């Protein structure tokens, strides 16, 4: 029906494919950050997952926040003591953009338990807006996934939740996932979820839509599969925890496939 919006879905997909390229953070920006590291970023991203769960925020909001943070750090040097401030402000902004009922600013100060004043959060909000030039409507892994999900016949909830889980794990690790565009991560996640659950592969219809094949997707897929296999040992565990919940069909409990077959 009109909910899935047949006169515009191809135009929209094309447009998002253009915009993900323009909203792409700088790959390896962390090498030009003298005071912060990929490990610190993973800590921050994992904490934002917890925040999104505490406040029952959309997954899309989380993804946006990450994109905001990565683009901000692509042009602004930040000291470690302030990295959480940047993150808090990004999450506020994402919430204001994306949520029907965003948490109030006071909730965001409260979640940084003591660290920053309200004033600092609000000033940082403004600075983030300036640095991003109010360019906040960024394409996310999720926006591509939800379109890819329409090509399932029929929809499978475990597949969807697993694809979302995999895309979300990618947020955590700048190395390697900053190299990959959201549409590509989403395609790799959808294929890997589809395979894990049903035995099926990236459908031809999505080859047609995206121009991507399993050959194109190979490098991302290889990284995602390793990420999936190593997930129980990663220092960051909030996404796994989250996806044990029945809301997400317990998908983080499924066993990853041993091999991919290519």
């Amino acid at each position: 029906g009109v909910n899935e919006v047949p006169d515009y879905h191809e135009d929209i997909h094309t447009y998002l494919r253009e915009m993900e390229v323009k909203c792409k953070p700088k790959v390896g920006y962390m090498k030009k950050q003298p005071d912060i590291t990929n490990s610190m970023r993973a800590i921050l991203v994992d904490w934002l997952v917890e925040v999104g769960e505490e406040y029952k925020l959309q997954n899309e909001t989380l993804h946006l926040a990450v994109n905001y943070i990565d683009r901000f750090l692509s042009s602004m040097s930040v000291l470690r003591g302030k990295l959480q401030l940047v993150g808090t402000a990004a999450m506020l902004l994402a919430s204001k953009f994306e949520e029907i009922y965003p948490p109030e600013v006071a909730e965001f100060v409260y979640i940084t338990d003591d660290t920053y004043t309200k004033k600092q959060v609000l000033r940082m909000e403004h600075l983030v807006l300036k640095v991003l030039t109010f360019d906040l409507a960024a394409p996310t892994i999720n926006q591509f996934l939800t379109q890819y999900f329409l090509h399932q016949q029929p929809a499978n909830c475990k597949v969807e939740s697993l694809a979302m889980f995999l895309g979300e794990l990618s947020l955590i690790d700048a190395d390697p996932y900053l190299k990959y565009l959201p549409s590509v991560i989403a395609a790799a996640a959808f294929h890997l979820a589809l395979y894990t659950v049903t035995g099926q592969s990236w459908p031809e219809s999505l080859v047609q839509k995206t121009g991507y094949t399993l050959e194109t997707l190979k490098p991302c897929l290889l990284d995602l599969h390793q990420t999936y296999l190593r997930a129980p040992q990663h220092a960051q565990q909030s996404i796994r925890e989250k996806y044990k919940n029945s809301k997400y069909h317990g998908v983080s409990l499924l066993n990853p496939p041993e091999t991919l077959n290519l």
Binding site: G1, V2, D11, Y15, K119
Partner: protein, 265 residues
């Protein structure tokens, strides 16, 4: 900062909208001044959406955002100046009427603007004549994107409190879980009929009165030709799935002879 702008007059309205002129270039602009809640809630979400979405939307029938001027305490949005809104134009034309060629021209341009929005995954959600701006050369443009939102495919549940009552689609009034691009088309349909009669089509006093007005009219515009009525009926289809899209409406026979007259301003 704002030192090159000379305020000319207040144009009405949160925040405040002024007509101004750039002293150096001569350009006339509309300035929208937005208070920042610097000790409380910060930048309003409505401003965040309006700005971010307008920056992406570059089209002849969408109001042009020219600049954003920041201070610690205020944000000013600098827009192209347009000379009045469609509601004022209709009122001024209450006795004379609006020639058909101009109605057709305006509808055609509104649909081009809207199709551009929808093709860029933006719902307007507040189409009403007060929000549609005209110039002296025959253009009309979508304005006031404060209630707009960037949507995903397929749509999720979004804010219920959307669209002014008279222009509100039945799927919203009835509290459907999902609404989509069809809600903007419904509004434009109402506006089409209103350009023809210069009276609101469904001027309800309450949600129930609104619904009853819709039901008794469409089933539970005299001066319009057959093609016009055909298009109008398709814009006002109850079923959002069957309601015509802006893209398909641009190919309707009603528009076969469209021109761009100047308004009787």
């Amino acid at each position: 900062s704002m030192e090159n702008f000379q305020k000319v007059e207040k144009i009405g309205e949160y925040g405040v909208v002024y007509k101004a002129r750039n002293k150096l270039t001569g350009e006339v602009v509309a300035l929208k001044k937005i208070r920042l809640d610097t000790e409380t809630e910060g930048v309003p979400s409505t401003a965040i959406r309006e700005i971010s979405l307008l920056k992406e939307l570059n089209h002849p029938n969408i109001v042009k955002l020219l600049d954003v001027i920041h201070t610690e305490n205020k944000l000013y949005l600098v827009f192209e100046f347009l000379h009045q809104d469609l509601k004022k134009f209709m009122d001024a034309s209450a006795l004379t009427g609006i020639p058909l060629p101009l109605i057709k021209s305006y509808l055609f341009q509104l649909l081009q603007g809207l199709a551009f929005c929808h093709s860029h995954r933006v719902l307007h959600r507040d189409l009403k004549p007060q929000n549609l701006l005209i110039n002296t050369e025959g253009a009309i443009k979508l304005a006031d994107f404060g209630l707009a939102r960037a949507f995903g495919v397929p749509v999720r549940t979004y804010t219920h409190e959307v669209v002014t009552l008279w222009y509100r689609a039945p799927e919203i009034l009835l509290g459907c879980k999902y609404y989509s691009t069809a809600v903007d088309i419904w509004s434009l349909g109402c506006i089409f009929a209103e350009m023809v009669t210069r009276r609101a089509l469904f001027p309800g006093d309450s949600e129930i009165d609104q619904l009853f007005r819709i039901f008794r009219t469409l089933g539970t515009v005299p001066p319009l030709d057959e093609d016009g009525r055909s298009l109008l009926s398709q814009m006002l289809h109850y079923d959002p799935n069957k309601r015509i899209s802006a893209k398909a409406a641009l190919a309707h026979p009603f528009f076969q002879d469209v021109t761009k007259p100047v308004p009787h301003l």
